[PDB]
From a paper:
pmcUbiquitin-specific proteases (USPs) are an integral part of the enzymatic network that regulates key cellular events by altering the ubiquitination status of a wide range of proteins. USP11 regulates multiple important cellular functions, including DNA double-strand break repair, cell cycle progression, and signaling pathways such as transforming growth factor beta signaling. The paralogs share the same modular structure consisting of an N-terminal domain present in USPs and a ubiquitin-like domain, followed by the USP protease domain composed of subdomains D1 and D2 interspersed by an insertion. Linear ubiquitin chains are particularly poor substrates for USP11 (15, 22, 23).
Two surface entropy reducing (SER) modifications to the RDFrzS sequence were also incorporated. The final construct, schematically depicted in Figure 1A consisted of the USP11 catalytic core (residues Met295-Pro489 and Pro778-Leu937), with the two subdomains linked by the novel RDFrzS fusion tag, which substitutes the 289-aa long insertion between Pro489 and Pro778 (USP11-D1D2ins). To gain insights into substrate recognition, we engineered a novel substrate mimetic comprising ubiquitin extended by three C-terminal glycine residues. To trap a Michaelis complex intermediate for crystallization studies, we mutated the USP11 active site cysteine and confirmed that the mutant was inactive. Crystals belonged to space group P 21 21 2 and diffracted to 2.44 Å resolution. USP11-D1D2 adopts the canonical USP protease fold with thumb, palm, and finger regions. The zinc finger (Cys468, Cys471, Cys802, Cys805) coordinates a cadmium ion, due to the crystallization additive CdCl2. The catalytic triad residues C318S, His888, and Asp905 are within hydrogen-bonding distance and adopt an active conformation. Electron density maps show both copies of the USP11 catalytic core interact with Ub-GGG in the S1 binding site with clear electron density for the entire extended glycine tail observed. The Ub-GGG NH group of Gly77 that is equivalent to a lysine side chain’s NH group in an isopeptide bond forms a hydrogen-bonding interaction with USP11 Gly887 from the BL2 region. The USP11 SL loop Gln398 side chain closes over the substrate’s C-terminal tail by forming hydrogen-bonding interactions with the Asp886 side chain and Gly887 from the BL2 region.
Residue numbers in the entry:
A (entry chain A): 302 to 612, 778 to 936
B (entry chain C): 1 to 79
């Protein structure tokens, strides 16, 4: 039939929805697809690169791109691509379910080496940043990366992080720059609140009030087990009652949490008779907030939002958390070479340079002693006008507006658990601006307000200057 | 030298390594601090996922660089 170019499904070859999803994201990266449709890749095939596969990844991907954008096919069977992918990365041999960002990482790397313009990779020790301006240090680090990696992949997807360490003792500052291809951002939380309260009627009232603003709420009247339940369920906030059954004391439980080095950072809202607040602030480690009993439910909800922020989790807050100033904990001190000793230094990641196409990877997973599970909380992300000027505009940096703003072009969606699931893709067609939902063979048009869902796992963003350059 | 790993929650940990350390060794040290089995760990630096058998210098991981640690969301859809 005569289909629309790029509007083409991909048959599942046996647990390969993760591959199809990654492929649909990439097919709708405009400069990559044009690079392959114009045969620009033929002149940059690197057959002697030991880290490549004799161009086979680039040629098989090119064939997929050409077939999908021909308008000749409703759907395509990418079996050759799968066989070449597995030959390059043996884990993908067979019929296993896989992570779609992992497949993308290997695919992008395969394309990069197969088209690497460097003949041989040289290791060059970076020089001390001490006393040199940030831009000069950043340039040396990018040029060290480019001396080894110079391809359309680097030109399209790679940016630069600044990482800064500050010694709390002597003030020594240590600057480093790392290239990146995936901006893997942590989640601030799941907007889950645990209520530790032996008054079950009161607890249910507060649960409804909180759920009325979108919080997930768990409840427990068992004070003895509360510390360990907090360690297991990892709530974003604890509403902790002072007077508990079986002679438990919320103030004492708070003390236990503030003494534990894992649990000391969990926000704690104490609800109790007000006449107990002065003493706890005078004698003990402060709860993060005190709310007087009979509880004004609106006041408690207001305080919860002020501490952890109202639902839902915003992509902006993931990026802000990623770039936050963090203090190294006692297990991870930095050896300051100026004062020649281990220090609980502060570390901050900054977005120094951002690529034409930005891949944002949400860390939708958690690992504790007790369980590993997927974080499935809704993360709101913008379809248009994602503005990084508040993160990139830092001392020794500037730009023009379109350089720091992005529009979404694709989303890889995951459904299921960590080890059993399914992948689909939202993607915006470069020729028409219409979004579609790709589920293996099934391709359907969608509006922009349908893209966002808790299934979103990998976001592809296109810098607003990119559309214009042609 | 020292390098850093930004973990699942964003918390950065510190590793004592040599440039010739293998990725298996690095993963073992990560497990020492965070308890994640090495087979579940995916480590990313500069748009490379780090593979057992190669060294930190192979991936151009120099001092005070930060690795990025992720897990897997596996999916196949059957099909
Ligand atoms: Cl490299």
């Amino acid at each position: 039939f005569k289909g629309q170019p790029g509007i083409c499904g991909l048959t599942n070859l046996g647990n390969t929805s993760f591959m199809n999803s990654a492929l649909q994201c990439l097919s709708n990266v405009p400069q990559l697809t044009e690079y392959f449709l114009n045969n620009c890749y033929l002149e940059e095939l690197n057959f002697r690169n030991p880290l490549g596969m004799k161009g086979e990844i680039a040629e098989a991907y090119a064939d997929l791109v050409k077939q999908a954008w021909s308008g000749h096919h409703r759907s395509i069977v990418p079996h050759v691509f799968k066989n070449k992918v597995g030959h390059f990365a043996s884990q993908f041999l067979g019929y296993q379910q896989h992570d779609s960002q992992e497949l993308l990482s290997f695919l992008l790397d395969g394309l990069h080496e197969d088209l690497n313009r460097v003949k041989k990779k040289e290791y060059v020790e970076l020089c001390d940043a001490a006393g040199r301006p940030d831009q000069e240090v950043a340039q040396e680090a990018w040029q060290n990366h480019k001396r080894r990696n110079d391809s359309v992949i680097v030109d399209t997807f790679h940016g630069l992080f600044k990482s800064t360490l500050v010694c709390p003792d002597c003030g020594n500052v240590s600057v480093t720059f790392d290239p990146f291809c995936y901006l893997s951002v942590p989640l601030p939380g799941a907007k889950k609140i645990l209520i530790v309260e032996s008054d079950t009627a009161l607890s249910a009232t507060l649960r409804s009030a909180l759920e009325g603003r979108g919080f997930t709420v768990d409840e427990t009247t068992d004070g003895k087990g509360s510390v360990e339940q907090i360690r297991r369920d990892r709530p974003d906030l604890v509403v902790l009652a002072v007077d508990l059954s079986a002679g438990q004391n919320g103030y004492l439980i708070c003390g236990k949490l503030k003494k534990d080095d894992d649990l000391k950072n969990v926000p704690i809202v104490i609800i109790g008779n007000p006449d107990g607040f002065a003493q706890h602030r005078a004698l003990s480690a402060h709860a993060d907030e005190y709310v007087a009993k009979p509880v004004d439910a609106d006041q408690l909800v207001e305080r919860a939002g002020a501490l952890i922020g109202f639902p839902p989790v915003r992509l902006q807050e993931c990026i802000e958390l990623f770039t936050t100033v963090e203090t190294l904990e006692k297990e991870n001190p930095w050896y300051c070479p100026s004062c020649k000793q281990h220090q609980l230094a502060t570390k901050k990641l900054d977005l120094w340079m951002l690529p034409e196409i930005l891949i944002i990877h949400l860390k939708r997973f958690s690992y504790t002693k007790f369980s590993r599970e997927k974080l499935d909380t809704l993360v709101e992300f913008p379809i248009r006008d994602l503005d990084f000027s508040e993160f990139v505009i830092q001392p020794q940096n500037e730009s023009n507006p379109e350089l720091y703003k992005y529009d979404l072009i694709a989303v890889s969606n995951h459904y299921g658990g960590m080890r059993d699931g399914h992948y689909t893709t939202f993607a915006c067609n470069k020729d028409s601006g219409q979004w579609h939902y790709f589920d293996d063979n099934s391709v359907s048009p969608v509006n922009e307000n349908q893209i966002e869902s808790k299934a979103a796992y990998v976001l592809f963003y296109q810098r607003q200057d990119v559309a214009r350059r042609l | 030298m020292q390098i850093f790993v930004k973990t699942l929650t964003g918390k950065t940990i510190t590793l004592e390594v040599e440039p010739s350390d293998t990725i298996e060794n690095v993963k073992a040290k990560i497990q020492d601090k965070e308890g994640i089995p090495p087979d579940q760990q995916r480590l990313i630096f500069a748009g490379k996922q780090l593979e057992d058998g190669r060294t930190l210098s192979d991936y151009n991981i120099q001092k005070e660089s930060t690795l990025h640690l992720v897990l897997r969301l596996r999916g196949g859809g059957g099909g």
